[PDB]
mmCIF file of all heavy atoms in Angstrom:
data_model
loop_
_atom_site.group_PDB
_atom_site.id
_atom_site.type_symbol
_atom_site.label_atom_id
_atom_site.label_comp_id
_atom_site.label_asym_id
_atom_site.label_seq_id
_atom_site.Cartn_x
_atom_site.Cartn_y
_atom_site.Cartn_z
ATOM 1 N N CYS K 25 13.591 -15.381 18.443
ATOM 2 C CA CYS K 25 12.132 -15.393 18.322
ATOM 3 C C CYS K 25 11.533 -16.580 19.064
ATOM 4 O O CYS K 25 11.907 -17.727 18.816
ATOM 5 C CB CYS K 25 11.719 -15.449 16.850
ATOM 6 S SG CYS K 25 12.233 -14.017 15.874
ATOM 7 N N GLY K 26 10.447 -16.329 19.783
ATOM 8 C CA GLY K 26 9.753 -17.402 20.483
ATOM 9 C C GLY K 26 8.470 -16.960 21.158
ATOM 10 O O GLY K 26 7.996 -15.836 20.961
ATOM 11 N N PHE K 27 7.931 -17.847 21.989
ATOM 12 C CA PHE K 27 6.835 -17.509 22.891
ATOM 13 C C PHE K 27 7.158 -18.034 24.274
ATOM 14 O O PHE K 27 8.019 -18.898 24.419
ATOM 15 C CB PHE K 27 5.512 -18.107 22.408
ATOM 16 C CG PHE K 27 4.976 -17.470 21.157
ATOM 17 C CD1 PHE K 27 4.789 -18.220 20.010
ATOM 18 C CD2 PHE K 27 4.570 -16.148 21.161
ATOM 19 C CE1 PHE K 27 4.317 -17.629 18.850
ATOM 20 C CE2 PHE K 27 4.106 -15.549 20.004
ATOM 21 C CZ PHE K 27 3.966 -16.296 18.855
ATOM 22 N N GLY K 28 6.358 -17.635 25.257
ATOM 23 C CA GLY K 28 6.606 -18.000 26.644
ATOM 24 C C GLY K 28 7.495 -16.988 27.343
ATOM 25 O O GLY K 28 7.992 -16.051 26.716
ATOM 26 N N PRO K 29 7.639 -17.126 28.667
ATOM 27 C CA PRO K 29 8.199 -16.036 29.461
ATOM 28 C C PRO K 29 9.599 -15.612 29.005
ATOM 29 O O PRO K 29 9.994 -14.464 29.219
ATOM 30 C CB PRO K 29 8.245 -16.638 30.864
ATOM 31 C CG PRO K 29 7.050 -17.529 30.899
ATOM 32 C CD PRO K 29 6.871 -18.069 29.504
ATOM 33 N N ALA K 30 10.395 -16.570 28.541
ATOM 34 C CA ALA K 30 11.792 -16.292 28.196
ATOM 35 C C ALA K 30 11.893 -15.337 27.017
ATOM 36 O O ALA K 30 12.882 -14.613 26.877
ATOM 37 C CB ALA K 30 12.536 -17.587 27.893
ATOM 38 N N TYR K 31 10.851 -15.307 26.196
ATOM 39 C CA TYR K 31 10.831 -14.457 25.010
ATOM 40 C C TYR K 31 9.921 -13.250 25.208
ATOM 41 O O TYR K 31 10.274 -12.132 24.851
ATOM 42 C CB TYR K 31 10.383 -15.261 23.786
ATOM 43 C CG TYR K 31 11.289 -16.425 23.452
ATOM 44 C CD1 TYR K 31 11.179 -17.632 24.136
ATOM 45 C CD2 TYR K 31 12.369 -16.255 22.605
ATOM 46 C CE1 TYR K 31 12.093 -18.652 23.943
ATOM 47 C CE2 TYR K 31 13.241 -17.295 22.346
ATOM 48 C CZ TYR K 31 13.164 -18.449 23.099
ATOM 49 O OH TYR K 31 14.129 -19.420 22.948
ATOM 50 N N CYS K 32 8.764 -13.473 25.819
ATOM 51 C CA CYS K 32 7.738 -12.439 25.859
ATOM 52 C C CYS K 32 7.799 -11.623 27.144
ATOM 53 O O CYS K 32 7.170 -10.566 27.246
ATOM 54 C CB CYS K 32 6.358 -13.063 25.710
ATOM 55 S SG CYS K 32 6.086 -13.891 24.129
ATOM 56 N N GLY K 33 8.583 -12.096 28.109
ATOM 57 C CA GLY K 33 8.657 -11.454 29.417
ATOM 58 C C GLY K 33 9.723 -10.379 29.473
ATOM 59 O O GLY K 33 9.827 -9.563 28.567
ATOM 60 N N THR K 34 10.418 -10.287 30.604
ATOM 61 C CA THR K 34 11.307 -9.158 30.855
ATOM 62 C C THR K 34 12.338 -9.032 29.736
ATOM 63 O O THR K 34 12.859 -10.040 29.250
ATOM 64 C CB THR K 34 12.032 -9.286 32.210
ATOM 65 O OG1 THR K 34 12.872 -10.445 32.199
ATOM 66 C CG2 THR K 34 11.025 -9.396 33.358
ATOM 67 N N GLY K 35 12.382 -7.847 29.138
ATOM 68 C CA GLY K 35 13.341 -7.550 28.078
ATOM 69 C C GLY K 35 12.854 -7.888 26.680
ATOM 70 O O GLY K 35 13.583 -7.707 25.704
ATOM 71 N N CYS K 36 11.618 -8.364 26.574
ATOM 72 C CA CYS K 36 10.984 -8.560 25.273
ATOM 73 C C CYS K 36 11.066 -7.295 24.425
ATOM 74 O O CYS K 36 10.735 -6.204 24.898
ATOM 75 C CB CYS K 36 9.522 -8.962 25.463
ATOM 76 S SG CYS K 36 8.622 -9.302 23.938
#
Side-chain angles (χ1 to χ4, degrees):
Chain K
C25 297
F27 290 119
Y31 299 81
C32 297
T34 63
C36 182

